[PDB]
């Protein structure tokens, strides 16, 4: 008689605990999870685990779960998370639940400083998250200190302003009040629309090298491939949109990305670890396929589309200037500020690094 296998699956805000069988496939486990939570925009999501050798792995839906060398423990431990992001959160997400799971996952990344976020944006996001959780601010319900348990902003932002925790709470409350009338779901959407303009939003970074051995980063996202220099993960230097990419493959350490324009050269780079390379391939093909499906069945910021949000950000800029402690800036702070001083942003930079033909950009790449 087959022995049942106890599993535990967590989403950003729930846990599921049930038993599967030795013949249960990843797809069957995945389907049980999404059905339980009522999630139907399944193309964005996957189950993540650690294998019996210590490596973070995404579950294959085709294979038996018992055959994927999941770390032996009772219960087996999985995390249900977004593996891919939409190109534009505003145009694409359909369900409340889908929006929520993205909102929670992105917010976790911002708060942990996995995703760099400048002070004024961080604070405004914080106030939108507060609107989402609490609903309309009401002085007679939300007495002083209602925010005392909240993770409002990244520690870095707190470290560089001469404000107390109580002052941070006072300031976030004022902005919370500004969002009166906004449905919780739309506050979650507004949060995502703001966050999606961040330099590091939605990007998976991988250590790579060009031919002459220069250490670089590869960025894989819904829009395409970016190349970063070793000490600057905010500012891509060279870019290849998915529209120019025919296929992606690798062998051992060598990645070959072929062009749609057959007369263009191949984009070639190196990455040292087999397991990581399998993941890079999956992320590339996955993002590429979604990209193509959107088109064959000029990007601006949320601030630029949304005059009110634009004013809110600049009002916060003025409000935070006095309290700023200029000796507390981090490396990423410094990079971001210099980009801003030059008038740059995510989309301007993306268009800039994508100019020139494929060969010119590959030649730049090999020169780094």
Structural domain spans, the chain? 1-86, 87-200+298-344, 201-297+345-368
CA distance 347 to 358: 19
State both tokens at 329. Answer: 């800036």
142 Cβ neighbours under 8 A, 6+ residues apart: 134, 173, 176
CB 349 within 8 A of CB 237: no
DSSP 8-state secondary structure symbol assigned to residue 66: G
Q: What is the CATH number of domain 1-86?
A: 3.10.20.90
The method recorded for this entry reads X-ray
Give the C-alpha separation, 112 to 151, whole Å: 10
Compute how many other C-beta atoms are within 10 angstroms of the C-beta atom of residue 248.
21
Which burial class, exposed, middle or buried, applies to 48 when counting CB atoms under 10 A from its CB (0-12, 13-18, 19+)?
Answer: middle
For residues 3 and 22, what is the distance between their CA atoms, to the nearest angstrom? 7
Contact 21, 2 (CB under 8 A): yes
């Amino acid at each position: 008689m087959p022995k049942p296998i106890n599993v535990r699956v967590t989403t950003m805000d729930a846990e599921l605990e049930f038993a599967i069988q030795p013949n249960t496939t990843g797809k069957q486990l995945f389907d049980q999870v999404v059905k339980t939570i009522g999630l139907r925009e399944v193309w964005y999501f996957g189950l993540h685990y650690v294998d019996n050798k210590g490596f973070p792995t995404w579950l294959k839906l085709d294979k038996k779960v018992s055959a994927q060398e999941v770390r032996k423990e009772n219960p087996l431990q999985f995390k249900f998370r977004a593996k891919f992001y939409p190109e534009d959160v505003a145009e694409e997400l359909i369900q409340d639940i889908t929006q929520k799971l993205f909102f929670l996952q992105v917010k976790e990344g911002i708060l942990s400083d996995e995703i760099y976020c400048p002070p004024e944006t961080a604070v405004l996001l914080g106030s939108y998250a507060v609107q989402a959780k609490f609903g309309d601010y009401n002085k007679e319900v939300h007495k002083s200190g209602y925010l005392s348990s909240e993770r409002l902003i990244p520690q870095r932002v707190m470290d560089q302003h001469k404000l107390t925790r109580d002052q941070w709470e006072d300031r976030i409350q004022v902005w919370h009040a500004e969002h009166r009338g906004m449905l919780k779901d739309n506050a979650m959407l507004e949060y995502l629309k703001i966050a999606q303009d961040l330099e590091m939003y939605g990007i998976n970074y991988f250590e790579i090298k060009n031919k002459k051995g220069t250490d670089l980063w590869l960025g894989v996202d819904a829009l395409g491939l970016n190349i970063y220099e070793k000490d600057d993960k905010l500012t891509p230097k060279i870019g290849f949109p998915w529209s120019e990419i025919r296929n992606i493959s690798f062998n051992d350490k060598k990645f070959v990305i072929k062009p749609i324009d057959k007369k263009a050269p191949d984009f070639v780079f190196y990455a040292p670890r087999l397991r990581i390379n399998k993941r890079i391939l999956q992320l590339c093909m996955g993002n590429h396929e979604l990209y193509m499906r959107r088109r064959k069945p000029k990007r601006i910021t949320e601030a630029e589309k949304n005059e009110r949000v634009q004013r809110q950000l600049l009002t916060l800029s003025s409000e935070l200037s006095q309290a700023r402690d200029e000796n507390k800036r981090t490396h990423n702070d410094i990079i971001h500020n210099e980009n801003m001083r030059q008038g740059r942003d995510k989309y301007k930079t993306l268009r800039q690094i994508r100019q020139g033909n494929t060969k010119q950009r590959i030649d730049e790449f090999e020169a780094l």
